A paper describes a structure:
The RGA5-HMA2 domain is contrived based on the high structural similarity of AvrPib with two MAX effectors, AVR-Pia and AVR1-CO39, recognized by cognate RGA5-HMA, the binding interface between AVR1-CO39 and RGA5-HMA, and the distinct surface charge of AvrPib and RAG5-HMA. Therefore, we reasoned that the mutation causing two amino acid substitutions (S1027V and G1009D) in the interface of the RGA5-HMA domain might interact with AvrPib while decreasing the binding ability to AVR1-CO39. V1027 of HMA2 could form the hydrophobic interaction with V27 of AvrPib, while it could affect the interaction with Y40 of AVR1-CO39. The G-to-D mutation at 1,009 of HMA2 could repel D35 of AVR1-CO39 while forming the salt bridge with R23 of AvrPib. Since there is a positively charged patch on the surface of AvrPib, the C-terminal K-rich region of the HMA domain would have blocked the interaction between RGA5-HMA and AvrPib. To circumvent the issue, we generated the RGA5-HMAK/E variant (K to E mutations including K at the 1,071, 1,073, 1,080, 1,081, 1,085, and 1,086 sites). However, no interaction was detected between RGA5-HMAK/E and AvrPib. Finally, we contrived another RGA variant, RGA5-HMAS1027V, G1009D, K/E (henceforth RGA5-HMA2), by combining all the above mutations, which were confirmed to resemble the native RGA5-HMA structure. Again, we performed a Y2H assay, which showed that RGA5-HMA2 could interact with AvrPib but not with AVR-Pia, implying that the mutations in RGA5-HMA2, which do not affect the conformation of the domain, acquire the binding affinity to the originally unrecognized MAX effector AvrPib. The data obtained from the MST assays also confirmed the interaction between RGA5-HMA2 and AvrPib, which displayed a dissociation constant (Kd) of 148 μM, compared to 31 μM for the RGA5-HMA/AVR-Pia interaction.
Several rice NLR immune receptors, including RGA5, possess an integrated heavy metal–associated (HMA) domain that recognizes corresponding Magnaporthe oryzae Avrs and ToxB-like (MAX) effectors in the rice blast fungus. Interestingly, RGA5 and Pik1 encode NLR immune receptors with a HMA domain, which acts as an ID directly binding corresponding MAX Avr effectors and mediates their helper NLR receptor–triggered immunity. The rice NLR immune receptor RGA5 recognizes corresponding MAX effectors AVR1-CO39 and AVR-Pia by its HMA domain (25–27).
Numbering used by the authors:
A (entry chain J), B (entry chain A), C (entry chain G), D (entry chain M), E (entry chain K), F (entry chain D), ...: 997 to 1069
C-alpha cells in the first residue's frame, strides 16, 4: 500500500469532485481525500498505483498537478 | 458535514473503482474510502450529501447497495 | 436492531434522568445510556425505533436535542 | 460507579418500558439495559445508587423483583 | 401591571422562539418568559396589553393557544 | 425444468454457503452452483422453482440479491 | 478443488432437498447436484471438503450414505 | 420369534435379490420380505436372530443398511 | 403379482436357508416364507416368476421339489 | 427420535401413573402412553432414549417390566 | 375420556419433562404429549381428570399455564 | 373467543341465580346462560377467561363444580 | 409346610389360570389362590415347594414374576 499526495488546482466544487472521481477510478485506490489549509492536497492511498500515470491523467483532465509525496504505509 | 457508510456489492476492483468514483463525483464529498474485512463498506464524508439519493445512485450502477450508517461530523 | 445517538443538553441529574427515562419508555428500546466526555450523548439501542419520532419527543418534552447518528447493528 | 442486575417480571413491552424508565429516573444512573436469555435481567449502572430502594421501587411498581448482582467497576 | 400565562403548542425550540418573539412584538409587553415542565407556557408581563389580540395572534401564527391566566401584580 | 441466475452479495465463504443451502432446500432443485469470476452468481436448476420467492428468501436471509436470468430448460 | 460423489438414499424431493442443502452448507462448496439413472448420486464440488465429515453428515441426517469417488480437478 | 426391519438402498433388483437372499441365508429366518412404498424395507422374522449381526452382514456385503425396528412377536 | 407354494425337503437349518436364499435370489421375488405343519412348504411371491423354472432349479439344488400351487393375488 | 414399547406390571391406576411419570421424567421424552387390551403396554417416544436404562428404571419402581419393541421414527 | 390442552412455559428439556411427569402422575391419565409449532401445548388425555386441579398443579410448579381446551372423545 | 360449560350443584332457583351471578363477575365473561334438562349447567362465553379461577370460584362459593367443556367459537 | 406369595403379571383370566394351574401342578401343593386388590398375588401353600424353581416356572410360562414372601407355617 502506497500514499500519494498531489497538489491540484481545485478552486470550486465541481472541479474538486472532478479530480477526486478521476483518482478514485484507478483500480486499487482505496482512499481518496482532499486536505490541507487551502483544500489543495489530493491524497490517494491504494495498491498497484502508478503515481506517474495518475498525475498525468490529472494534468490532462484538470489543470496543473504537482507530485509531492510517494510513501509506503 | 456528515459521514455515511454504505454496504455496496463491489466484489472486485473495477467495481470498487466505480463506486468510489460515483461517490467522489458528488459535489461536497471530501472523503471516499473502502473498508470492511470483506471490502464492501463504502465510507463517504462531505457536506450536504443526501444519503438516500447517494444509496440509490450506488444501487443504479452497482446493482445492490444498503445504507448502514449516517453520522453528523 | 438500531443504535441512535442524540446530543442533549442535560447539565444536571434531573435533566439527565428526564431524557433517559423518556427514551426508556419507548417500546422496543433495550439499551439507554449517557456517554461522552461532556455527558451530553444519549445512546439508544433497540428494535423498530424511529429516530425522527424519538428526537421529536425529546424536543417536545426536554428540549435542546440534536440527532447525531443512526446505525444498523 | 457500581453495577446492579435485578431479575424482574417483564413479560411484554409496556412492562419493560416502565421498569427501564423507572431505573432511568433515579438520579446518578448512567446505564439501563435489558439483558438475559429470557429478557428478565434489568442491568442498572450509575453513581450513588442504593440497590435496596431501587429494588424496593421495582417491587412496588413492577411486581416481583430479585436483586442478583451489585458490584463496583 | 398585568401578568398573562398562555399555554401554546410549541413542541420544539424553533417553535418556542417564534411564539416568544411574536408575543414580545404585541403592544405593551415588557417581558416574555417560557415556563412549564414541558416548556409549553409563555409568561407575558406588561402594561396595557390586550390579551385577546395576543392570544389570537399566537393562534393564527403558532397553532393552538389557551389563555390560562390574566392577573395583576 | 427452469434455470435461474441470481447475483448475491456473498463476500465470504460462510455467506456463500447459506445462499447455496437456501436454494438447495427448495423442493425440486436439482442443481445449485456458485459461478462467475467474482464468485457472486448463484445458479439454481430444478422443477417448480418460483424465481420471485427465491430472491425474496435470499434477500431475507442473505441480505442483498438481484435476479439476473430466468430460463426454461 | 475436489469432486465428491456420494450414494445417498433420497427417494423423494424432501430428502433430495435435505441432502442437497446439507452438502451446500459446507464452507467452500460451489457445486451440488443430483445425478444418476436412479437419482441417488449427489455430486459435491468445492474447496476444503472433508469427505469423511461430509458423508458422516449425510448418513447422520439421511440414514444411508456411501462415498463413491474422490477426484481432483 | 422376532421381527427386524432394515432400511436398505436397493434401487434395482440385483441389489434387492442380494440383500434378500443374504438375510434368507441366516439360520433361524422363516420370513424375509421387501416392503414399503419406496421398496427399501427389508423385513426379517425368525428365532434367535441377532439384529446387530444381520445389519453388520448387510453392511459388509451390500452396503447402505440401517436398522429400523426390532420387535418380539 | 403371483403366489407359489412348493413342498421341499428341508430337514435342517442349513437346508431351509439354502432353499429360501435361492428363491430370494430370483429377480422379481418380494416375499419368501417357510410355512406348513412339517416345515416343508416354501412360499414365494413376486413379479415375473416362472414357476417351472423356479421348481426346476429347486430340484437341482435341494433334491425333491413338488409344485403344489400357483395363484394370482 | 425413537419409539419404545415396554410391557409393565401396572394393574391399577396408581401404578400406571407411576410408570407414566417415570417415562415422562426422562429428558427428551415427548410422548408417553398407556396402550393394550390389558393396559400393560407403556409407549414412550422421544430423543436420545436408552431403552435398556428405561426398562431398568421401570423395573426398579414397578418391579416387573419387559422390553417389547424399539423402532426408529 | 377427555382431552386437555394446556399452554405451559417449558423452554428446555428439563422443564418439559417436569410438566409431563406432573400431568402423567394424575390418576386416570393415559396420554401425555408435547405438540405445537412452539412446543408449548401439553396435551393430556384420560379418564376422571379434573382440568382445574391439574392446571393448578401445573401453575404451582412450572410457571404459568393456560387452559386452552377441554373436550370429549 | 371461548365457550365454557360447567356442571354446578344448584338444585333450586336461588342457587341457580347465585352461581350465574358469580360466573358473570369473573374477568372476561360476556354471557352466562343456564341449561341442561335439570337446569344444572352454566354456559359461559367470553374472551380472556381463566376457566380455572372461574370453576374454582364456583367450587368455593356454590359447592361442587365440574368443567365439562372449554372450546373456541 | 411353606407359604409363598408371588407377584405375577396376569392381567386377564386366561393368564391367571395359567399361573394357578402351574403352581397347582407342583406335587405337595394344597392351596393355590389369587389374592390382592389388583388380583396379581399368587399364594401357594404346601409341602416341598421350591420358591426359586416356582418363580422360574412362572416366568418361563407366564412372563413376569417377582417373589414377595417365603414363610414357614
Amino acid at each position: 500500500r502506497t500514499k500519494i499526495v498531489v497538489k491540484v488546482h481545485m478552486p470550486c466544487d465541481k472541479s474538486r469532485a472532478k479530480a477526486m472521481a478521476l483518482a478514485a477510478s484507478v483500480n486499487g485506490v482505496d482512499v481518496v481525500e482532499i486536505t490541507g489549509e487551502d483544500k489543495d492536497r489530493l491524497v490517494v492511498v491504494g495498491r498497484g498505483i502508478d503515481p506517474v500515470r495518475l498525475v498525468a491523467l490529472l494534468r490532462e483532465k484538470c489543470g496543473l498537478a504537482e507530485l509531492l509525496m510517494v510513501e509506503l504505509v
